[PDB]
Amino acid sequence: STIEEQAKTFLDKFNHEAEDLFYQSSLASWNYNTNITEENVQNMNNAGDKWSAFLKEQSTLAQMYPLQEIQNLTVKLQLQALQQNGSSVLSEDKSKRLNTILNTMSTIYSTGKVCNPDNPQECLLLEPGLNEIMANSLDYNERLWAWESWRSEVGKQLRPLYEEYVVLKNEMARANHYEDYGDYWRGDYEVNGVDGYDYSRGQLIEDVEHTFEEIKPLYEHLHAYVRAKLMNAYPSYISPIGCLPAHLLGDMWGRFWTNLYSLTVPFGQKPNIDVTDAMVDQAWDAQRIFKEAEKFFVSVGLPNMTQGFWENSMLTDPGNVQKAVCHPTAWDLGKGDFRILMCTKVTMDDFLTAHHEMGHIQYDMAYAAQPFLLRNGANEGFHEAVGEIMSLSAATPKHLKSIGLLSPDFQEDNETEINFLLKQALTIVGTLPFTYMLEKWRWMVFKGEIPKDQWMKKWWEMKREIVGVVEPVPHDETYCDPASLFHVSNDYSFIRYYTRTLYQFQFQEALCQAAKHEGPLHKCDISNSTEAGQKLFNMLRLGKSEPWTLALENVVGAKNMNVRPLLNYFEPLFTWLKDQNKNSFVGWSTDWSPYAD
Amino acid sequence: TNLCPFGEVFNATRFASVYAWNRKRISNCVADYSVLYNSASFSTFKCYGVSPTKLNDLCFTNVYADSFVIRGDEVRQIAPGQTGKIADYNYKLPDDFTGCVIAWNSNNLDSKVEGNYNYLYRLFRKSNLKPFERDISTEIYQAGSTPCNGVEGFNCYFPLQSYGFQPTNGVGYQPYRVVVLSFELLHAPATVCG
Ligand SMILES: *[C@@H]1O[C@H](CO)[C@@H](O)[C@H](O)[C@H]1NC(C)=O
Ligand SMILES: *[C@@H]1O[C@H](CO)[C@@H](O)[C@H](O)[C@H]1NC(C)=O
Ligand SMILES: *[C@@H]1O[C@H](CO)[C@@H](O)[C@H](O)[C@H]1NC(C)=O
Ligand SMILES: *[C@@H]1O[C@H](CO)[C@@H](O)[C@H](O)[C@H]1NC(C)=O
Ligand SMILES: *[C@@H]1O[C@H](CO)[C@@H](O)[C@H](O)[C@H]1NC(C)=O
Ligand SMILES: [Cl-]
Ligand SMILES: [Zn+2]
User: Cβ(B101)–Cβ(B44) under 8 Å?
Assistant: First the structure.
């Protein structure tokens, strides 16, 4: 009788049909990524739009149940996840303009290419050409060319598309009774209707600013040391007090700083830990890499990969006849089908990525008992953080000794510890100002706190002051530099990376203290720690059936994103940098320019 | 003193749908269940009321072997006193149950590429099923009170859904052929015995 039971019956039918339609979608897309044939891309597209038309029809049917008269917040979260009609709440004229805008932007990204003025014939796509250029060049000018030319040839095409796109996204958002599209996005972090654990869509903005406040000291110290090394590598192109140029950050935008290790390594003669040769010498194969990742997970208390994972996974690149996209990827096809697609090499890096993807698989296995609509990360940042902590605690020298892969006479020391930690900080800390600043610019643009006539003017300001990075060339209002990045021009929200980084070190410190680990947080190896296993699984098993604040409290005993565990993890490196910085300026002044001479 | 065709009951070409769950009435035979127990080819063999060891020479009037295919995850619902879709709306086991549940994976027979959709389970019902009652009804389940007049639409559904049984399914989503035995009690002579 009651409307509650109408919603219940509706979801009970939707789940049992959406399951199989999504499974067909998934098998078709898998068979594609495994064996690229035009037969297969066609089967893929067919099943894809079948399931998409189904969920549009179901969204229509679902909006016939007002959110008012429902109390069960499980039922209400499912009805809300479905009822979110999206572009279908627009007039089909406007939805058409929207989707041609979106596809035009995606293709201007993917098919974009930059050409040298010396030769109108030969020129380069982004990956691998320009990505490898920016990742490996030690030359100032050629990196500058890759950077500025990719921004001036692909971004300027996306600028007006991005303006029209933000207009129609704001209208689609205000037509869904959100305030803006940025608000639509932060709706991923909203909790309503649970006393004490709720969260509003501006509380996220203030929380992220607050945690970034405490991260500013560590990042300033690391930024100062990295600037010191980079000037001992780029004598005339970096100032001791100014900000870091954007093209010299190891890739096209500066998102991660990994590629600066060979320039910032503290002990440039003490060796890294690179254990590929120990896998070579002992007849380790892909089966061995993944058997060791599986065993590392059973050590902590999580179950092992199921037989279907062994049968159906593409674990090695399968020859020259059949083609496949070798992006390491974990697959939940639904219906109990968990697989991995990864062209495995015999390398330390792939050895670790095995643990990462297996952690993705373990998160997927954890919440697969939830209702279909609630089979996801507790919020948009939990999956990848769960994946990353396993890579951490599997790259530990004591872990490499416990598995016969390093000699017990290996000497851990100040040298190896500061090496590992500075590499880690290049990858993990150098991305937090970037991620925070990008999503802040996007939010401010969707809310309208930046008129389009000042779009770029605000971008490169939030760079100079939040990330300590300056653009190497003046960028007027025709660029849309933000969209030269994938996630912007491809309509993906970004703050997942900030929240994920912070959550991963919160989880890490929590699981390490549950491990009774003594000594610095980096040496922590949660293997053989069933306590870390229970503490991680108590959050894993939830999915988005609970407010992400509650699940976060299930692991870290705090109700909200916190940055004390991250600073704790980087404490040894923190004080080493403080010793290295005695007679150098920590912090940057946002006035110096690469191009104002 | 002949043998009851236990093979076909376990070996039939394609099984029946759980909503119209097939029933065999096994009578007047010799039946040593020892081989079925220790066949070690069944992934689940749970006897409720008397353990599989002794039932070889406890003497029954007449036994029913219900058979169907469900998902693996659903096998637990075939247990006296459970809840869920398969337990409430397709096949309900009474808590005073006596016979056993014999589930074995059939990812190779009952599943096939592109999915084997021949099996159906009833997803909705205006009331729970009684023990052992079979509902084959096909009348559009009315979620509200707005009449539907025998055609699907909004708030009215077809109460029969199909399993999609591919061979790449997980062990819980894999077609599990389930044979349930419930033994009877009567003062008429016990005829299934030995
Ligand atoms: C690869 O694709 C062809 C045609 O698309 C198909 O017939 C073949 O079975 C595929 N390979 C495998 C191993 O399935
Ligand atoms: C919400 O619904 C689920 C399944 O529909 C049920 O198990 C749960 O008890 C309900 N919550 C409340 C508070 O009744
Ligand atoms: C995982 O380990 C348990 C331990 O007995 C074992 O029973 C199970 O079969 C293992 N998983 C697989 C896929 O074999
Ligand atoms: C985990 O425990 C096993 C049990 O013998 C041991 O062999 C292994 O070295 C331990 N590894 C770690 C990292 O504690
Ligand atoms: C089903 O057939 C196999 C194949 O011979 C046989 O071993 C088995 O006993 C049969 N099932 C039953 C219940 O007898
Ligand atoms: Cl940029
Ligand atoms: Zn990942």
Answer: yes
Q: Does A198 touch chain B (CB under 8 A)?
A: no
Contacts of residue A187, defined as CB under 8 A and 6 or more positions apart, other chains included, come to A178, A201
Helices (H) and strands (E) in chain B, counts: 3, 9
Of residues A391, A470, A380, the one with CA closest to residue A423 = A391
How many CA atoms, within 13 angstroms, populate the side-chain half-sphere of residue A7?
A: 23
CA A491 to chain centre: 14
Tokens 């062994």 — which residue? A310
Q: If you measure CA to CA, which chain B residue comes closest to A310?
A: B168
Give the H/E segment covering residue A572: helix A571-580
Quick one: resolution in A?
2.8
Q: What is the 3-state secondary structure (H, E, C) of A13-52?
A: HHHHHHHHHHHHHHHHHHHHHHCCCHHHHHHHHHHHHHHH
Give distance in angstroms: CA of A528 to centre of ligand 5: 44
Read off the amino acid at residue A4.
E
> Helix or strand or coil: residue B150?
coil
CB A181 within 8 A of CB A492: no
CA distance B78 to A356: 37
Spell out which chain B residues touch chain A, with contact meaning CB-CB distance below 8 angstroms.
Answer: 72-73, 85, 115, 123-124, 141, 143-145, 154-155, 157, 161-162, 164, 166, 168-174
| Chain B residues near residue A1 by CB distance under 8 angstroms | 144-145
Asked if A4 reaches chain B (Cβ–Cβ under 8 Å), the answer is no
User: Does B6 sit in the ligand 5 pocket, CB within 6 Å?
Assistant: yes
* Residues of chain B positioned with their CB less than 8 A from the CB of A309: none
Q: Which two tokens stand for residue A277?
A: 């040769």
Put simply, the answer to whether A13 touches B123 (Cβ < 8 Å) is yes
Q: Would you say A441 and A461 are in contact if contact means Cβ atoms under 8 Å apart?
A: no
Q: Exposed, middle or buried by CB within 10 Å (0-12, 13-18, 19+), for A519? A: exposed
Which structural technique was applied?
cryo-EM
Q: Which residues contact B155 (CB under 8 A, 6 or more apart)?
A: A6, A10, A64, B142, B143, B144, B146, B148
Mutation pick for ligand 5 pocket among B13, B32, B39, B106 (CB with most ligand atoms within 8 Å): B39
